[PDB]
Design a protein around this ligand. Structure first.
Ligand SMILES: CN(C)CCNC(=O)c1cccc(-c2cnc3ccc(-c4cccs4)nn23)c1
Length: 293
């Protein structure tokens, strides 16, 4: 009964089909947290496994770019995962509020995302649902680091053991191997990082169709473009990283630590363009609006 007795519940930060996240304060310290609240009534043994796996994954991952777990509390009927509170909102909503936004800032963001995908992979965790809603920002007052969130769909892998761990993911970000029902692993997070990198540069997604089945065929072919004019001002090194992240052969796809050594990431001041990209800001506003529905 540790949560009800020591915490005060506040407003809802987000809601889904099977959980809710609410802000909360610890009554003794006055420190503020985010509580993920899961109904544990009448779960199967399969669901109990998934929920204790989520709590295990969140306890293990300690990294400046991953939401930090403060306590996992089991009350009768409910489970609470209590994370340190990050107040900076979604990454993509902070970007559209910037008056200066360049490839160097995109590279900065993707470098933090990559550090976190890397830390997951070193601990043998595949996130499987990288997407803008899962990319929070720490307060500008605390450094504005990017925070990877929500490991509810994550899996634990041993070494490079690859298998068909079932369908999971969000359609625009799904890798070709998942869509083929082929065995997959860590590379599915690098594919998603390439879709996010792409959107971070131009404000719209690399694969898109109003017909989801045609969307899937485009993904499986790996058929994205760098159309003029917007891509004409983008450096070739940034286009090269996308190319290595969006390869349909998962064995040849670049890995997270290899991508942290790409010159566009680790030689940012000399390689990434520093011009403001106002057309990306505008497209991203339309991107963010559509995803809100
Ligand atoms: C879309 N998913 C992210 C899940 C639903 N949550 C939201 O939409 C949301 C929106 C705005 C802010 C927050 C927020 C603020 N501080 C924290 C700390 C930790 C976490 C999470 C850990 C595991 C899952 S959320 N969320 N969190 C969540």
């Amino acid at each position: 009964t540790r949560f009800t007795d020591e915490y005060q519940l506040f407003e809802e930060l987000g809601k889904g089909a099977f959980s809710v996240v609410r802000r909360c304060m610890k009554i003794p310290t006055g420190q503020e947290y985010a509580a993920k609240i899961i109904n544990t009534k009448k779960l199967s043994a399969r669901d109990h496994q998934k929920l204790e796996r989520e709590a295990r994954i969140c306890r293990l991952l300690k990294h400046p770019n991953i939401v930090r777990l403060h306590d996992s509390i089991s009350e009768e009927g409910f489970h609470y995962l209590v994370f340190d509170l990050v107040t900076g909102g979604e990454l993509f909503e902070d970007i559209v509020a910037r008056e200066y936004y360049s490839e160097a800032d995109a590279s900065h963001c993707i470098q933090q995302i990559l550090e976190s995908v890397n830390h997951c992979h070193l601990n043998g965790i595949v996130h499987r649902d990288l997407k803008p809603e899962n990319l929070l920002l720490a307060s500008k007052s605390k450094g504005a680091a990017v925070k990877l969130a929500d490991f509810g769909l994550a899996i634990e892998v041993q070494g490079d053991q690859q298998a068909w761990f079932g369908f999971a993911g969000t359609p625009g970000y799904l890798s070709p191997e998942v869509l083929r029902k082929d065995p997959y692993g860590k590379p599915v997070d690098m594919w998603a990082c390439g879709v996010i990198l792409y959107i971070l540069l131009v404000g719209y997604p690399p694969f898109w169709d109003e017909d989801q089945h045609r969307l899937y065929q485009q993904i499986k072919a790996g058929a994205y473009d760098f159309p003029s004019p917007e891509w004409d001002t983008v450096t070739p090194e940034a286009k090269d990283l996308i190319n290595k992240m969006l390869t349909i052969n998962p064995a040849k796809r670049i890995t997270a630590s290899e991508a942290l050594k790409h010159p566009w990431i680790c030689q940012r001041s000399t390689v990434a363009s520093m011009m403001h990209r106002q057309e990306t800001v505008d497209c991203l506003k339309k991107f963010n609006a559509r995803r809100k529905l």
